[PDB]
Design a protein around this ligand. Structure first.
Ligand SMILES: Nc1ncnc2c1ncn2[C@@H]1O[C@H](COP(=O)(O)OP(=O)(O)NP(=O)(O)O)[C@@H](O)[C@H]1O
Length: 424
């Protein structure tokens, strides 16, 4: 009977999924963000709010009447500052890909060497940058991540985040605390309390139950980031399970009983339940494929490939020089020579070489300490190529298949479900 709502506030719009406890989808939908008024100090936040309301209205009323728990994801390190008394957003949000280099020396001066916050786009650089603009009454401010803020609109309890959203401000999900090097600074007073992803915060506000017809006992749960929600959608929860995203770039995520963080390779871990999601990304993948072939050409040429035959071609397919993972070399050259006369042989070589890079990535994660990969699920455009799936199964020497779900909003609905089950 009960249903579970997940929303995904991504880079360009919002999406929602409603599931039952078995993971069957009962409603889903998407909305692009609307414009905001030039003079609106909330900026994009006013648009996100509008989208939230739109998405809620888009859920069928009968479905809304059964929704028992809500969670949502947002973009990583998208940062808002609010007044703690009035709820007022004090400036336009610092977007995920927005950088604050002015604050980076200060951050490097306080953080452990090569900490994940030591990047201009980190939540902590944004916090320090805002702090240092010396807004009157800055000590009465609070920081919220995008996901946190949208959830707070729903439950009305100011200042709660999750293990995943808070990583880029310096939160340590292993000790479940902010570290002393961060707590030692005065802007730490702005930091939100932090819970596990998908845990209950409070009941949905009466304004929403009355306006939209949600049941009175509907709860609102902490969320996560869009990247992690997308991983969660694959419904893989055991150590050794992995998801490869064959998108414009190649990204891999491996579930592990051991935490792995390594600056050389840009490898970073998030907490997931009682485990660690270990991630890395290569510049190889779909972008270079697209540079060489249309989607239709990839289709047709792929049907001429025998995926059980190994290509002799050793490529490192890149559009331009440079790699961080699984090779740390800013000057790593593309290698697409020799190029055979046959476009089928060329493509086979490219797909097989990208599979080698994938394999090398999983090997590197293992050697850095992660639980060894046991099964690889596939997301992204590349997942629709079954020939490539077979090639990758052979080259990786592991079972490979399609992830059944890949939408972040689906993963968020799983967090809503988790929160509800834990709550009862
Ligand atoms: N049949 C195919 N085989 C292999 N690659 C393909 C095929 N069709 C499309 N692609 C690639 O899929 C890529 C798009 O993947 P997609 O995953 O939608 O991109 P993205 O921008 O990274 N978004 P995301 O889904 O989050 O990874 C393009 O670069 C295409 O080259």
């Amino acid at each position: 009977e009960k249903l579970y709502l997940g929303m995904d506030f991504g880079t360009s719009g919002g999406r929602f999924t409603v599931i039952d406890e078995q993971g069957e989808i009962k409603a889903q939908g998407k909305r692009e963000y609307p414009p905001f008024m030039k003079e609106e100090s909330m900026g994009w936040a006013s648009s996100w709010k509008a989208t939230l309301f739109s998405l809620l209205e888009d859920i069928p009323v009968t479905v809304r009447s059964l929704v028992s728990s809500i969670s949502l994801d947002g973009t990583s390190a998208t940062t808002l500052i609010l007044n703690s008394e009035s709820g007022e957003v004090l400036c336009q949000p610092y977007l995920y890909n927005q950088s604050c280099p002015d604050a980076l020396p200060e951050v490097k001066s306080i953080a452990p060497a090569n900490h994940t916050v030591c990047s201009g786009t980190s939540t902590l650089c944004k916090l320090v940058s805002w702090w240092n603009t010396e807004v009157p009454n800055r000590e009465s401010a609070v920081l919220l991540h995008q996901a946190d803020w949208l959830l707070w609109l729903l439950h009305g309890r100011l200042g709660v985040s999750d293990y995943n959203n808070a990583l880029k401000v310096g939160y340590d999900p292993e000790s479940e605390s902010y570290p002393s090097w961060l707590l030692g600074q005065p802007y730490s007073q702005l930091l939100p309390k932090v819970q596990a992803p998908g845990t209950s915060i409070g009941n949905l506000k009466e304004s929403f139950t009355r306006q939209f017809g949600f049941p009175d006992d509907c709860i609102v749960c902490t969320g996560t980031t869009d990247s992690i929600a997308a991983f969660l959608a694959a419904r893989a929860t055991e150590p050794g399970k992995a998801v490869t995203s064959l998108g414009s770039t190649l990204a891999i995520k491996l579930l592990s009983t051991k935490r792995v963080d390594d600056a050389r390779y840009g490898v970073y871990s998030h907490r997931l339940d009682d485990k660690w999601l270990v991630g890395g990304a290569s510049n190889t993948g779909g972008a270079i494929l697209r540079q060489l072939f249309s989607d239709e050409q990839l289709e047709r040429l792929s049907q001429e490939i025998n995926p059980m035959v190994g290509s002799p071609l050793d490529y490192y397919p890149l559009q331009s020089s440079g790699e961080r993972f699984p090779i740390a070399d800013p000057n790593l050259a593309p290698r697409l020579l020799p190029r055979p006369e046959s476009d089928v042989e060329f493509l086979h070589g490219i797909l097989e070489s990208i599979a080698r890079i994938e394999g090398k990535g999983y090997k590197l994660l293992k050697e850095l300490g992660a639980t060894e990969a046991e099964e690889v699920l596939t997301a992204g455009g590349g997942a629709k190529n079954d020939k490539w799936i077979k090639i990758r199964q052979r080259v990786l020497g592991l079972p490979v298949k399609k992830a059944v779900h890949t939408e972040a909003s689906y993963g968020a609905s799983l967090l809503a479900l988790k929160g509800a089950k834990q709550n009862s």
